[PDB]
């Protein structure tokens, strides 16, 4: 594993120091349907016309990004995604910009959102939850070794591919940092205590989010919830979590070690690091190598009708992609 990481960091660094730019154009793609939306952007199913290859394209409005003060975070997402490579991370295939927007063209994950399936199904069995959790663990092992913090783990950002495996998407809050960072980032339900306590935080927040994710997958609802954010933040600091009775003993134990407010006792952030997780009882049946190699039998396979199918996603109101005659925030996004 150390051999693999050393090699991974070399390839990563090369790309980080010399990032790729404008490797495609908008009119080479056929806009087919909006797959999802958010803050100041939307993701659509697109077809590369010359090849017939389908892709997922995120479109950001430059002015909207500036308005929401996401300039630096956006540049981070662009520079990091073009430099990383892991089977469970969505691969940025092309990126370009025009007078009005920023474009990220990535591998399309036809299976849909984990959020969708979990809400519809209610909750995942422990083995089903364990399967996804293992992919996240390995992904965080990879990302962290590169000094990257993800900061937005949640069902909404995890898509299922054709094989029923996970594809981590949306690196809008990802950042390469050594030491502590301070940005109040994330989604309320998955924020670690340190993020709300202004003392700064490190990679350990991703491990707390993992604990929230495993909890929500196995229970059907988050460990900390309430009508408004402020109510949520308070529960997160009370350091008290209630577990459903159907939770196994090993699962409750792992969770207590993951949702640990004391940063000196939280798993993933200790002396043995990620291994304290990989070797925990709840993961005894998990074959880490087989998972990385994608050879473990997926508990859920969202088969679909040929390429370009969007049946596993919801319906959104379509909107035209506007491109002014005037170049907008040219300077601000010059390196994108």
């Amino acid at each position: 594993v150390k051999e693999f990481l050393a090699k991974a960091k070399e390839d990563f660094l090369k790309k980080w120091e010399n990032p790729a730019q404008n490797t495609a154009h908008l009119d080479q793609f056929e806009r087919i349907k909006t797959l999802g939306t958010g803050s100041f952007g939307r993701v659509m199913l697109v077809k590369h016309m010359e090849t017939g290859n389908h892709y997922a394209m995120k479109i950001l409005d430059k002015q909207k990004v500036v308005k929401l003060k996401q300039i630096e975070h956006t540049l981070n997402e662009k520079r990091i995604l073009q430099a990383v490579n892991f089977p469970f991370l969505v691969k940025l295939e092309f990126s370009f910009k025009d007078n009005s927007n920023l474009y990220m063209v990535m591998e399309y994950v036809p299976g849909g959102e984990m959020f969708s399936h979990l809400r519809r199904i209610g909750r995942f069995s422990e083995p089903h939850a364990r399967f996804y959790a293992a992919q996240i663990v390995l992904t965080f092992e990879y990302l962290h070794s590169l000094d990257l913090i993800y900061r937005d783990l949640k069902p909404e950002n995890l898509l299922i591919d054709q094989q029923g495996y996970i594809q981590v998407t949306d690196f809008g809050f990802a950042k390469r940092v050594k030491g502590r960072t301070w940005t109040l980032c994330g989604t309320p339900e998955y924020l670690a205590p340190e993020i709300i306590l202004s003392k700064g935080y490190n990679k350990a927040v991703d491990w707390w989010a993992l604990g929230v994710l495993i909890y929500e997958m196995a229970a059907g609802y988050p460990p900390f919830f309430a009508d408004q954010p402020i109510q949520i933040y308070e529960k997160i600091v009370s350091g008290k979590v209630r577990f459903p009775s159907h939770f196994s003993s090993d699962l409750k134990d792992l969770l207590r070690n993951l949702l640990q407010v004391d940063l000196t006792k939280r798993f993933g952030n200790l002396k043995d690091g990620v291994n304290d997780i990989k070797n925990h009882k709840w993961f005894a049946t998990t074959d880490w190598i087989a998972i990385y190699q994608r050879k473990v039998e997926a508990p859920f396979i969202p088969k679909f009708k040929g390429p370009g199918d969007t049946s596993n996603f919801d319906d959104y109101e379509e909107e035209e992609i506007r491109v002014s005659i005037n170049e907008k925030c040219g300077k601000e996004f010059s390196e994108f």
Binding site: S39, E156, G172, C185, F225
Partner: peptide
């Protein structure tokens, strides 16, 4: 039940991230 309280909450839909 906890499930009922969650489903009756306004936070069962896609959750928007917090920026600033």
């Amino acid at each position: 039940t906890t499930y009922a309280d969650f489903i009756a909450s306004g936070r069962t839909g896609r959750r928007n991230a917090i920026h600033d």
